[PDB]
Amino acid sequence: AIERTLSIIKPDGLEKGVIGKIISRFEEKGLKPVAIRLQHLSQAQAEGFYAVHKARPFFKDLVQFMISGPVVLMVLEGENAVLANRDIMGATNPAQAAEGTIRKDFATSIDKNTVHGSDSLENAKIEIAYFFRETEIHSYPYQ
Amino acid sequence: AIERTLSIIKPDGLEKGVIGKIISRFEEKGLKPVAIRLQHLSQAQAEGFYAVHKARPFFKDLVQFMISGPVVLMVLEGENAVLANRDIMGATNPAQAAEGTIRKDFATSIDKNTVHGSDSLENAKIEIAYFFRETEIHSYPYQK
Amino acid sequence: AIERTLSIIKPDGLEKGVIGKIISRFEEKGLKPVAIRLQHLSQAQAEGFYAVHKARPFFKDLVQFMISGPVVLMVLEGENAVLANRDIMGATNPAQAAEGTIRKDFATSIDKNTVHGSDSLENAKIEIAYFFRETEIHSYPYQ
Amino acid sequence: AIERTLSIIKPDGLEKGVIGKIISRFEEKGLKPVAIRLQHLSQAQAEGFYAVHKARPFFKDLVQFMISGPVVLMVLEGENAVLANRDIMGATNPAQAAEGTIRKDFATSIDKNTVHGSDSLENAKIEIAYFFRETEIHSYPYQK
Ligand SMILES: Nc1ncnc2c1ncn2[C@@H]1O[C@@H]2COP(=O)(O)O[C@H]2[C@H]1O
Ligand SMILES: Nc1ncnc2c1ncn2[C@@H]1O[C@@H]2COP(=O)(O)O[C@H]2[C@H]1O
Numbered sequence: 001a002i003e004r005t006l007s008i009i010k011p012d013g014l015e016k017g018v019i020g021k022i023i024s025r026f027e028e029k030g031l032k033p034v035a036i037r038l039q040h041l042s043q044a045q046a047e048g049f050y051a052v053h054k055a056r057p058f059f060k061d062l063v064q065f066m067i068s069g070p071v072v073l074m075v076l077e078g079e080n081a082v083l084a085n086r087d088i089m090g091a092t093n094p095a096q097a098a099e100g101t102i103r104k105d106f107a108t109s110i111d112k113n114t115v116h117g118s119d120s121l122e123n124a125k126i127e128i129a130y131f132f133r134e135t136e137i138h139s140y141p142y143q
Numbered sequence: 144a145i146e147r148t149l150s151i152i153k154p155d156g157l158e159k160g161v162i163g164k165i166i167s168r169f170e171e172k173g174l175k176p177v178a179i180r181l182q183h184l185s186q187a188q189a190e191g192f193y194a195v196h197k198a199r200p201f202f203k204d205l206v207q208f209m210i211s212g213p214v215v216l217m218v219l220e221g222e223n224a225v226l227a228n229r230d231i232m233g234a235t236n237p238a239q240a241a242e243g244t245i246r247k248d249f250a251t252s253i254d255k256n257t258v259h260g261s262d263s264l265e266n267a268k269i270e271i272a273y274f275f276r277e278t279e280i281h282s283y284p285y286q287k
Numbered sequence: 288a289i290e291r292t293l294s295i296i297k298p299d300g301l302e303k304g305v306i307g308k309i310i311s312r313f314e315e316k317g318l319k320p321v322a323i324r325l326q327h328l329s330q331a332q333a334e335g336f337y338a339v340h341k342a343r344p345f346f347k348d349l350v351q352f353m354i355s356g357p358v359v360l361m362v363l364e365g366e367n368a369v370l371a372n373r374d375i376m377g378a379t380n381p382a383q384a385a386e387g388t389i390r391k392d393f394a395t396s397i398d399k400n401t402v403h404g405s406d407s408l409e410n411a412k413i414e415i416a417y418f419f420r421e422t423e424i425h426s427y428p429y430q
Numbered sequence: 431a432i433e434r435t436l437s438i439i440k441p442d443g444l445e446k447g448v449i450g451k452i453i454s455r456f457e458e459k460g461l462k463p464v465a466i467r468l469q470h471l472s473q474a475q476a477e478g479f480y481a482v483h484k485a486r487p488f489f490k491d492l493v494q495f496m497i498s499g500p501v502v503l504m505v506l507e508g509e510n511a512v513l514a515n516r517d518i519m520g521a522t523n524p525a526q527a528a529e530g531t532i533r534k535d536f537a538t539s540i541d542k543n544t545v546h547g548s549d550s551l552e553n554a555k556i557e558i559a560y561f562f563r564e565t566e567i568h569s570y571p572y573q574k
């Protein structure tokens with residue numbers, strides 16, 4: 001089914017100058033960007049967004065990196081988007097990422113892994129509403 | 144010096160699924176996207192943005208096309224960005240556009256010419272302020 | 288229970304210069320404004336927001352009035368907010384509105400009735416997400 | 431002539447539950463709110479907004495207070511709005527504030543002085559552009 005999922009190009013992705021290349025990976029696989037906004041997250045925004053990891057030992061580092069510079073927030077729409085997105089991104093740890101994935105091609109380490117994608121449809125709903133009004137999301141037909 | 148200019152990927156750009164290709168054209172040339180927002184313009188927003196051409200015969204059609212679908216608004220930053228942006232975009236009329244430019248590679252007609260870029264530094268300041276708060280624009284370093 | 292509901296000060300409310308008076312009505316009754324944004328709705332936004340009335344005969348007029356000028360969008364937080372808000376607003380038709388209500392005091396007619404409030408908690412969730420990101424809503428304590 | 435100026439209702443204003451009272455002070459004086467947005471400022475936003483006072487000894491405390499809770503950002507429009515706004519707000523130090531002004535009626539101390547208003551027209555232009563796109567500002571007529 002057609003689903004909507006959240007994608008975030010992390011600070012390292014912008015610094016590497018590959019925003020366009022990452023978006024093209026999605027577009028060519030049928031994941032249509034229907035919302036996009038470059039933003040610099042505050043500490044409160046990063047902490048609230050990653051609440052599910054608050055008990056994890058990497059939480060503090062994740063938050064500091066996520067606010068180290070601006071990120072590109074996006075909503076991708078497409079067939080089985082939640083899973084398709086994660087496949088395209090590749091393993092969380094670049095070392096284990098498959099060839100041709102965003103993380104294998106551009107990520108430096110597990111901490112600076114270039115992208116985030118919602119892990120489930122339930123989480124996607126929450127993550128999207130966290131950063132986008134419904135009025136900021138616009139589908140359009142492909143020609 | 145380092146300047147900022149406005150770039151808009153028109154509805155036809157999104158419909159052809161080439162948002163990434165266009166952004167890459169800028170990144171590879173050293174024009175850094177420091178603000179990006181996909182938005183669906185209202186008639187009032189388009190008319191206000193293109194007010195200078197209100198006395199033009201194509202104005203009405205321009206507005207209808209500009210509100211026919213969503214667009215991607217962007218602020219590009221770099222050395223002589225206003226001019227560099229115009230070089231990368233190519234001639235307003237795709238037919239007259241040079242090889243390798245965005246309009247020559249992606250545009251279909253003068254009306255559906257894929258992108259808009261501020262024509263001068265004075266206009267850039269106005270176009271940027273029209274669509275972005277200064278707090279929505281963020282520079283960052285380029286590093287691998 | 289503490290709930291969040293959507294409130295909209297319609298074009299006529301701004302034209303009458305009573306934005307502050309309306310907000311004070313809420314504040315003094317314990318309905319805390321936790322999100323506020325002045326905005327000029329486009330036709331598509333008004334139509335999508337009032338989708339539930341698309342089959343009604345007043346739909347077209349409602350949409351035209353709602354885009355006639357800017358409005359103030361707000362999220363109110365408080366005890367039994369959905370119902371409390373509607374009580375404070377008063378009857379949809381100013382003619383039947385109770386004394387002391389926003390509509391009795393400021394509304395001109397059923398068409399230009401100054402305010403909108405979500406009619407239910409289910410609708411509140413939808414209306415709020417339509418106009419606000421979760422990151423645009425901020426609770427604060429009263430002192 | 432008709433000007434636009436920035437007004438910020440500081441954290442203490444929201445905590446006392448007087449957002450409406452303050453906005454009414456402006457409306458009753460003919461200062462029309464043409465842009466309004468409740469927002470929680472980040473440290474970077476506050477520091478950037480108050481950069482001129484970075485060499486001041488109270489700067490650090492100013493920033494902490496300005497990010498301690500959400501604020502209401504507004505653009506006011508009217509004849510000689512910049513000056514009219516300053517009259518309504520009253521002296522920066524509530525103690526020195528005249529009767530009937532916002533600071534005399536609501537402020538607690540110089541640090542917790544309830545509102546900020548642009549001090550000049552030049553600054554207003556900068557402060558407004560910092561927090562609002564031109565497309566987020568909308569004038570309307572006053573009529574019953
Ligand atoms: N060992 C770890 N397991 C999972 N994620 C980790 C770990 N260490 C760091 N992280 C990071 O924490 C992030 C949380 O979600 P992301 O999808 O953004 O990607 C994750 C990784 O970048
Ligand atoms: N005769 C024309 N000359 C210039 N602009 C035109 C003409 N016909 C249509 N247009 C469009 O009007 C637009 C005005 O600004 P753009 O930079 O968006 O690009 C222009 C063209 O796409």
Ligand SMILES: Nc1ncnc2c1ncn2[C@@H]1O[C@@H]2COP(=O)(O)O[C@H]2[C@H]1O
Pocket residue numbers: 340345349379397398399400402403404
């Ligand atoms: N007879 C009607 N019944 C209900 N709402 C009406 C009617 N005619 C016009 N309306 C308007 O339609 C609006 C829809 O929801 P509101 O709460 O915004 O308030 C309603 C009234 O302003």
Ligand SMILES: Nc1ncnc2c1ncn2[C@@H]1O[C@@H]2COP(=O)(O)O[C@H]2[C@H]1O
Pocket residue numbers: 483488492522540541542543545546547
């Ligand atoms: N000694 C001081 N002189 C001026 N501003 C001060 C002083 N101490 C604290 N401040 C605060 O610093 C703020 C700077 O701009 P505001 O208009 O927000 O109002 C000012 C006061 O609230």
